Amino acid sequence: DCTMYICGDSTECSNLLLQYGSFCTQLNRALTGIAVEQDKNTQEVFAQV
Amino acid sequence: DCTMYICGDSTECSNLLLQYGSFCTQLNRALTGIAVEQDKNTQEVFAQV
Amino acid sequence: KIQDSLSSTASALGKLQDVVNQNAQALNTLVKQLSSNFGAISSVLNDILSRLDKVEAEVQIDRLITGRLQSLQTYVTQQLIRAAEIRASANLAATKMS
Amino acid sequence: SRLDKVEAEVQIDRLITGRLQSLQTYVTQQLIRAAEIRASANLAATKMS
Amino acid sequence: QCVNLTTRTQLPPAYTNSFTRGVYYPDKVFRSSVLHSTQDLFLPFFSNVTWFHAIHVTKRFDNPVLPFNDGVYFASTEKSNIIRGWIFGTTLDSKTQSLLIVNNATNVVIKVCEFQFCNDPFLGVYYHKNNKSWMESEFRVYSSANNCTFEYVSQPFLMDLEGKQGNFKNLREFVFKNIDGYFKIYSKHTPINLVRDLPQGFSALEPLVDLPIGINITRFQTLLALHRSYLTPGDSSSGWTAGAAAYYVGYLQPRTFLLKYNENGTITDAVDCALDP
Amino acid sequence: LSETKCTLKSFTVEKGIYQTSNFRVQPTESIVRFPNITNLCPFGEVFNATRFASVYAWNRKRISNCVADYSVLYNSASFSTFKCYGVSPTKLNDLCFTNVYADSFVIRGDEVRQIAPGQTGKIADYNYKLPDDFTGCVIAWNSNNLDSKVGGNYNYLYRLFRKSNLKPFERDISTEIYQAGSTPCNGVEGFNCYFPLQSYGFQPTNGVGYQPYRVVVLSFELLHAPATVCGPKKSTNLVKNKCVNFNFNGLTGTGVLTESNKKFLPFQQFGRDIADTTDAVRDPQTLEILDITPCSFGGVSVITPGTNTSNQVAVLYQDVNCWRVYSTGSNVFQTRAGCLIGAEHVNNSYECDIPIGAGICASYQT
Amino acid sequence: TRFASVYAWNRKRISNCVADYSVLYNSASFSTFKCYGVSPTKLNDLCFT
Amino acid sequence: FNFNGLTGTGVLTESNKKFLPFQQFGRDIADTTDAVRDPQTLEILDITPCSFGGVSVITPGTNTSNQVAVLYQDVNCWRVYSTGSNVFQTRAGCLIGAEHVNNSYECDIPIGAGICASYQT
Amino acid sequence: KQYGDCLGDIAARDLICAQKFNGLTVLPPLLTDEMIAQYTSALLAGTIT
Numbered sequence A, B: 001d002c003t004m005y006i007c008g009d010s011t012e013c014s015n016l017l018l019q020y021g022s023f024c025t026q027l028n029r030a031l032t033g034i035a036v037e038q039d040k041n042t043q044e045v046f047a048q049v
Numbered sequence C: 001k002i003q004d005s006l007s008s009t010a011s012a013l014g015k016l017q018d019v020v021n022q023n024a025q026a027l028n029t030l031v032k033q034l035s036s037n038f039g040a041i042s043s044v045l046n047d048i049l050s051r052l053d054k055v056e057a058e059v060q061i062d063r064l065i066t067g068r069l070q071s072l073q074t075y076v077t078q079q080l081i082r083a084a085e086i087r088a089s090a091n092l093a094a095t096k097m098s
Numbered sequence D: 001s002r003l004d005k006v007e008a009e010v011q012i013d014r015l016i017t018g019r020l021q022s023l024q025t026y027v028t029q030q031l032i033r034a035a036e037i038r039a040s041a042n043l044a045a046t047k048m049s
Numbered sequence E: 001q002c003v004n005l006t007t008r009t010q011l012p013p014a015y016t017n018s019f020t021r022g023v024y025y026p027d028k029v030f031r032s033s034v035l036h037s038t039q040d041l042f043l044p045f046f047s048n049v050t051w052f053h054a055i056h057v058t059k060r061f062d063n064p065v066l067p068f069n070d071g072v073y074f075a076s077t078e079k080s081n082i083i084r085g086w087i088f089g090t091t092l093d094s095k096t097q098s099l100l101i102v103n104n105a106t107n108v109v110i111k112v113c114e115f116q117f118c119n120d121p122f123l124g125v126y127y128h129k130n131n132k133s134w135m136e137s138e139f140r141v142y143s144s145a146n147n148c149t150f151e152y153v154s155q156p157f158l159m160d161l162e163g164k165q166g167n168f169k170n171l172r173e174f175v176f177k178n179i180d181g182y183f184k185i186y187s188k189h190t191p192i193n194l195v196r197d198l199p200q201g202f203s204a205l206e207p208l209v210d211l212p213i214g215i216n217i218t219r220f221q222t223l224l225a226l227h228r229s230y231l232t233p234g235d236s237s238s239g240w241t242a243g244a245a246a247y248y249v250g251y252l253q254p255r256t257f258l259l260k261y262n263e264n265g266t267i268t269d270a271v272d273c274a275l276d277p
Numbered sequence F: 001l002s003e004t005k006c007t008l009k010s011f012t013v014e015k016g017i018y019q020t021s022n023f024r025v026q027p028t029e030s031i032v033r034f035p036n037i038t039n040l041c042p043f044g045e046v047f048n049a050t051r052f053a054s055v056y057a058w059n060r061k062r063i064s065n066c067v068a069d070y071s072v073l074y075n076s077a078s079f080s081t082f083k084c085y086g087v088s089p090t091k092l093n094d095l096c097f098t099n100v101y102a103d104s105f106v107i108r109g110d111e112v113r114q115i116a117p118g119q120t121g122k123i124a125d126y127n128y129k130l131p132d133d134f135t136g137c138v139i140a141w142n143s144n145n146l147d148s149k150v151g152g153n154y155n156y157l158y159r160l161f162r163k164s165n166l167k168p169f170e171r172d173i174s175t176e177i178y179q180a181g182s183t184p185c186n187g188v189e190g191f192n193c194y195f196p197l198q199s200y201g202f203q204p205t206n207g208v209g210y211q212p213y214r215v216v217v218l219s220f221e222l223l224h225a226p227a228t229v230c231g232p233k234k235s236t237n238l239v240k241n242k243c244v245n246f247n248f249n250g251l252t253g254t255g256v257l258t259e260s261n262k263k264f265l266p267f268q269q270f271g272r273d274i275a276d277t278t279d280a281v282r283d284p285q286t287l288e289i290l291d292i293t294p295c296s297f298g299g300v301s302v303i304t305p306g307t308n309t310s311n312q313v314a315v316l317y318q319d320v321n322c323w324r325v326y327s328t329g330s331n332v333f334q335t336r337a338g339c340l341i342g343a344e345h346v347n348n349s350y351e352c353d354i355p356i357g358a359g360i361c362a363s364y365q366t
Numbered sequence G: 001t002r003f004a005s006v007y008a009w010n011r012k013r014i015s016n017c018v019a020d021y022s023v024l025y026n027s028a029s030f031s032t033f034k035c036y037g038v039s040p041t042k043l044n045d046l047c048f049t
Numbered sequence H: 001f002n003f004n005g006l007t008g009t010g011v012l013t014e015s016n017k018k019f020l021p022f023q024q025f026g027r028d029i030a031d032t033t034d035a036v037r038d039p040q041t042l043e044i045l046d047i048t049p050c051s052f053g054g055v056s057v058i059t060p061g062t063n064t065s066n067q068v069a070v071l072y073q074d075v076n077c078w079r080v081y082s083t084g085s086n087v088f089q090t091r092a093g094c095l096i097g098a099e100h101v102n103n104s105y106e107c108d109i110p111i112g113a114g115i116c117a118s119y120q121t
Numbered sequence I: 001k002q003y004g005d006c007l008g009d010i011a012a013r014d015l016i017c018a019q020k021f022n023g024l025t026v027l028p029p030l031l032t033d034e035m036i037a038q039y040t041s042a043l044l045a046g047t048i049t
């Protein structure tokens, strides 16, 4: 959670962070890819039969 | 094209960007490697015979 | 049956379409990230250069330059990481051909 | 607590830039590690078969 | 001269949903075919707006003093021009300054004076037989106004005072904000054909005016017009008929919205990013 | 070829094909389109006034439809303070201003420092506060000759007590008894019950810190909305379909101007794209929407054998269909990767030497 | 009544008190007031060590 | 809160920590203030953030429906946006808005820890 | 890990609480360990018989 890591509970920091929203969407896109790939790894190794 | 992405048609931005020239040469070096590798991939798959 | 299954369903070639989509989305994200202020008073160089003189303008233009260079660096790093995986797939396809 | 909302932004933008770069470094290294884990999982899926 | 009103019946307050209404153009920059994310004071989606009206020759005549927390969404469905404006202030007496926006059937008057407002401010419309004519008759709003730092009077006009009979035809939406000494108003007139409630729809309000009034505003009150004629044989305090009109009041909050700009420059849809997951 | 030599940072180039900067076009003219306003701004009524206001009830004046040639003040006026916020002083002549308001009042000399964003003090707390994100200029000048009379001048008041600080640009003209204790004041001054306004005492021989100062605060926005007040810039003719430097209501830039399909609402002056760059503008003199397009466009690659072998080059203009080329001559060949200029096209087929793209290769042969 | 010479300047400890500097608004007038490491509009909300 | 000028947001609870007489605040590894001594009563208190816990929303296409189920990992069914019928506790968190069936199907929407969701009649 | 478990100084003491209070979540895998064990027992029963 970008806003919680960078800004915590600060509202001013969040309003300032609204400039960098594409970068956080990008970070979470990459992490989501990694996560579904972990599940696909386990599938391709164990669910052959 | 670094100068077009970062600076557009601005001459002042270009003169200021002349400090970061190694970084743009580096970026384009990496991208050029990727491009010739794409061509090598297609070669190694299809031009075996 | 192969031919009919291909001619009926539209999303059978999911992996190739995913490659195409990922490249297109990376470029479009790189274009959209030109709207970031990166801490400057504006994200438009012409706005900054219209309002501020050449000494107060550099403080903002250097912020914009640092941010946009970091955007390009992120794009290139992710392209290298994706090219490694595409090259693994191409080596597998070259092994399957042989 | 110490600075008003105009002097505070100069510092908060520094903090935001730094923390976003921290997250970016984390995600980049997670992608590089996930590539190696995926190579290992492909090898394990080949050894299974 | 500042009469109080009697013969009003007592009814509980009503409530109504805000089916995605109250969106306004955030800036003055033109955009097309783009989804623009914006954070600003906005009326949240499916909000709980309070319902007031004036009805039944007199049963209901609602003009209470409402709060003005950070901004007001104000809608009014009417057919015979009963809503005439508002009063904005903090104590609404002559100790402090107040903002008066009123349409006296002839001009739009915007004043920032020190008004000594009435307990029941209203305007009057009289209906004459042997004429079948309705004419502006009363302006019982304030007792006095001394130190008046701002004033605007529009170009003259004549708007029809006839009481219409039928459905509500006109929906008029207004967003009022008070920031940095400016009183911002955004408006949108929409034709309707409806009986009872808020028309569920979407319409983006357009910037109307920024007034440099520079006052503190915490409460406000709506200015209605009542009808008086031979059918109302009482005195000033008792004997008058309301007509038919209703207005709704919602409050703005700092929200993030995702606005959808058309291929032309119009906002056609929006998302309330904090409504639900 | 020299762009490559500089990019490689060497005087030698190996055989190959190299990307260079995109095709650039330089602007041929400069364009200035400001509105056709003629009146000079009321510098006389604002700066040269018989009576200024008290700081507690400060005056706001709307400025519209005028030319802000402030060099008319050079002959008569002299300012101890002139600080601009969000704009540079040397840029005011090339800019149009959006919602100009002039705030004016008279304060003590020791309080001019308090008219600035983020200040505290008796003025900034109780009389006149500037917002933190203030765009405009603050002007002040000593007025001891005009505003100080022998025996003290007691016309200028200021609020001394107030239950809470003012908001930005908020005005408080209330005059009710300030209750400084817990016991109530029933509208009469007494013990811990003070009238909230006190008068400056402006004797002529007061020290410079206690001498009257006339302050003017100008508020505006820049480059976001239609503007009527504009700086002194001589306006030129409109040039379309050509790479020009433009200046529309203060917004500078470079590009090609063409007529547009867009319809701006009457309160709109600029249009922006996803990257927030201005891509449409309404001409201030003739209200017509125009579209702004960059001049530089199109990728360029230079094909070289080693500079050790030759100094000939062929240039590939992807995104050109043979023109927007650096030079043309003989040997213009249209490939699917772009227009190739400087290479002779043969009909034989060989193994690839220098990959050009889309099935075409180049080589240095006899 | 008496201030010190700059060469032998006086240092005074302040403790156990409430800093409501608005009591100076009636009597004092300062040509210079510059704060370092803190914003002037924040002094009412802080406690000083 | 505002403790001696230090502002912030959180939940205050009584602490095991013992501050030396010259100490007023306590910080964690990230240097955020996590303990404070109350100035009026000299008792140590612990500051804990208010926001906590991951949330996922499960949707069929908005083209198909506007129903959603929300998964609150780190909740054991509450700290939920809304509750009603259909509260199901999985090992990945509390799932609210989905009906739990006894059959087993191939995965449609992976929820985690062996649970999947789908939009069926 | 519930909020009532991280409530108090256990937040600073535990590492997972410190991660969760800063927006860093660990998502559970899709296949449980029992399911992976069923897959391996199926592979064993297929290869044995």
Ligand SMILES: CCCCCCCC/C=C/CCCCCCCC(=O)OCCOC[C@H](OCCO)[C@H]1O[C@@H](OCCO)C[C@H]1OCCO
Binding pocket: E081, E083, E084, E085, E101, E102, E103, E108, E150, E152, E154, E155, E172, E174, E185, E187, E189, E208, E209, E210, E211, E212, F060, F061, F062
């Ligand atoms: C100290 C420095 C000074 C600076 C000065 C800057 C600001 C001064 C300018 C003020 C212009 C205000 C324009 C908005 C209302 C007048 C609108 C107008 O000039 O046309 C008159 C027709 O009315 C149109 C409007 O609505 C049109 C539909 O009839 C009216 O409808 C009325 O309510 C509905 C009853 O019909 C009220 C009123 O608008 C309310 C204002 O918020």
Ligand SMILES: CCCCCCCC/C=C/CCCCCCCC(=O)OCCOC[C@H](OCCO)[C@H]1O[C@@H](OCCO)C[C@H]1OCCO
Binding pocket: G011, G012, G013
């Ligand atoms: C310009 C404007 C500024 C005005 C005010 C600013 C600040 C002035 C405050 C001064 C407080 C000083 C107190 C600290 C040491 C005194 C120690 C004390 O108030 O307790 C007395 C008991 O002694 C404890 C200490 O040690 C306790 C063990 O006996 C002593 O031991 C001694 O040496 C060991 C022999 O027993 C010396 C001494 O401490 C040395 C000081 O460094």
Ligand SMILES: *[C@@H]1O[C@H](CO)[C@@H](O[C@@H]2O[C@H](CO)[C@@H](O)[C@H](O)[C@H]2NC(C)=O)[C@H](O)[C@H]1NC(C)=O
Binding pocket: E002, E003, E004, E119
């Ligand atoms: C209308 O009614 C209000 C109260 O409902 C009257 O205001 C009161 O006036 C009396 C004496 O004039 C005061 O003792 C009360 O304290 C007032 N109440 C309020 C709320 O201010 C008002 O005078 C009436 N107006 C007329 C002319 O009938």
Ligand SMILES: *[C@@H]1O[C@H](CO)[C@@H](O[C@@H]2O[C@H](CO)[C@@H](O)[C@H](O)[C@H]2NC(C)=O)[C@H](O)[C@H]1NC(C)=O
Binding pocket: E104, E105, E106, E107, E109, E136, E139, E153
């Ligand atoms: C509506 O309000 C306007 C503004 O007060 C009234 O017009 C003014 O009338 C007075 C008295 O004749 C004049 O002194 C002002 O100069 C007028 N103002 C302007 C500029 O129009 C108007 O009479 C009112 N109409 C009704 C029906 O009450």
Ligand SMILES: *[C@@H]1O[C@H](CO)[C@@H](O[C@@H]2O[C@H](CO)[C@@H](O)[C@H](O)[C@H]2NC(C)=O)[C@H](O)[C@H]1NC(C)=O
Binding pocket: E128, E129, E130, E131, E133
């Ligand atoms: C018909 O309308 C006219 C004006 O349009 C009315 O004339 C005025 O009416 C008021 C109140 O009735 C009187 O105080 C004025 O003295 C009248 N002035 C004129 C010009 O006559 C007229 O009264 C209306 N007819 C009826 C029957 O009410």
Ligand SMILES: *[C@@H]1O[C@H](CO)[C@@H](O[C@@H]2O[C@H](CO)[C@@H](O)[C@H](O)[C@H]2NC(C)=O)[C@H](O)[C@H]1NC(C)=O
Binding pocket: E146, E147, F057, F173
């Ligand atoms: C606000 O109103 C008060 C009360 O009318 C004004 O004070 C009077 O102003 C006149 C004109 O200068 C003087 O002749 C009186 O002696 C003043 N005293 C009173 C209480 O009557 C005051 O000037 C007005 N102006 C502002 C903006 O404060």
Ligand SMILES: *[C@@H]1O[C@H](CO)[C@@H](O[C@@H]2O[C@H](CO)[C@@H](O)[C@H](O)[C@H]2NC(C)=O)[C@H](O)[C@H]1NC(C)=O
Binding pocket: E262, E263, E264
């Ligand atoms: C957008 O603007 C256009 C131009 O004002 C509106 O008019 C449409 O224009 C197109 C192209 O000429 C025509 O094909 C349509 O028939 C026009 N529509 C009508 C009936 O006016 C258009 O309505 C606006 N809105 C949208 C959503 O396109």
Ligand SMILES: *[C@@H]1O[C@H](CO)[C@@H](O[C@@H]2O[C@H](CO)[C@@H](O)[C@H](O)[C@H]2NC(C)=O)[C@H](O)[C@H]1NC(C)=O
Binding pocket: E090, E091, E216, E217, E218, F163, F164, F165, F166, F167
């Ligand atoms: C705007 O007006 C409100 C109401 O008059 C003010 O709020 C009051 O503030 C005083 C202290 O300044 C308190 O004693 C009252 O209890 C408050 N009343 C309410 C309803 O909150 C507010 O302070 C004014 N705004 C400014 C900037 O002064």
Ligand SMILES: *[C@@H]1O[C@H](CO)[C@@H](O[C@@H]2O[C@H](CO)[C@@H](O)[C@H](O)[C@H]2NC(C)=O)[C@H](O)[C@H]1NC(C)=O
Binding pocket: F321, F334, F335, F336, F337
């Ligand atoms: C360069 O332009 C020419 C025409 O200007 C293109 O040739 C045309 O290609 C289209 C393909 O859809 C054909 O329908 C036309 O009949 C062709 N015209 C001629 C004159 O042959 C050519 O394709 C363009 N070059 C590239 C590589 O894009």
Ligand SMILES: *[C@@H]1O[C@H](CO)[C@@H](O[C@@H]2O[C@H](CO)[C@@H](O)[C@H](O)[C@H]2NC(C)=O)[C@H](O)[C@H]1NC(C)=O
Binding pocket: H076, H089, H090, H091, H092
């Ligand atoms: C949610 O809470 C319940 C109890 O509040 C947990 O169920 C317990 O699990 C432990 C495992 O160590 C058993 O020892 C207890 O006997 C169980 N209690 C009951 C009454 O069932 C449950 O595991 C928690 N949910 C998750 C997924 O963590």
Ligand SMILES: *[C@@H]1O[C@H](CO)[C@@H](O)[C@H](O)[C@H]1NC(C)=O
Binding pocket: E015, E048
């Ligand atoms: C609107 O608010 C009132 C005030 O409590 C409440 O009774 C009513 O239920 C709310 N409306 C809805 C439908 O939420």
Ligand SMILES: *[C@@H]1O[C@H](CO)[C@@H](O)[C@H](O)[C@H]1NC(C)=O
Binding pocket: F043, F044, F048, F076
């Ligand atoms: C200001 O006013 C004085 C006297 O009215 C006049 O002499 C002087 O020229 C004026 N300055 C200008 C040029 O505005």
Ligand SMILES: *[C@@H]1O[C@H](CO)[C@@H](O)[C@H](O)[C@H]1NC(C)=O
Binding pocket: F036, F284, F285, F286, F287
């Ligand atoms: C001046 O501008 C107006 C628009 O306000 C325009 O109608 C008029 O033709 C212009 N005159 C010129 C172009 O000189």
Ligand SMILES: *[C@@H]1O[C@H](CO)[C@@H](O)[C@H](O)[C@H]1NC(C)=O
Binding pocket: F308, F309
């Ligand atoms: C390349 O360089 C070497 C040494 O500079 C030279 O001997 C050789 O002749 C050059 N190649 C050609 C073909 O000119």
Ligand SMILES: *[C@@H]1O[C@H](CO)[C@@H](O)[C@H](O)[C@H]1NC(C)=O
Binding pocket: F345, F346, F347
């Ligand atoms: C190549 O062949 C085509 C047709 O075969 C002919 O028109 C063209 O002139 C030839 N080009 C050369 C270089 O002779």
Ligand SMILES: *[C@@H]1O[C@H](CO)[C@@H](O)[C@H](O)[C@H]1NC(C)=O
Binding pocket: H039, H040, H041
């Ligand atoms: C005031 O603070 C002291 C600590 O110095 C404390 O002992 C006393 O009880 C406090 N009084 C209160 C809480 O009013």
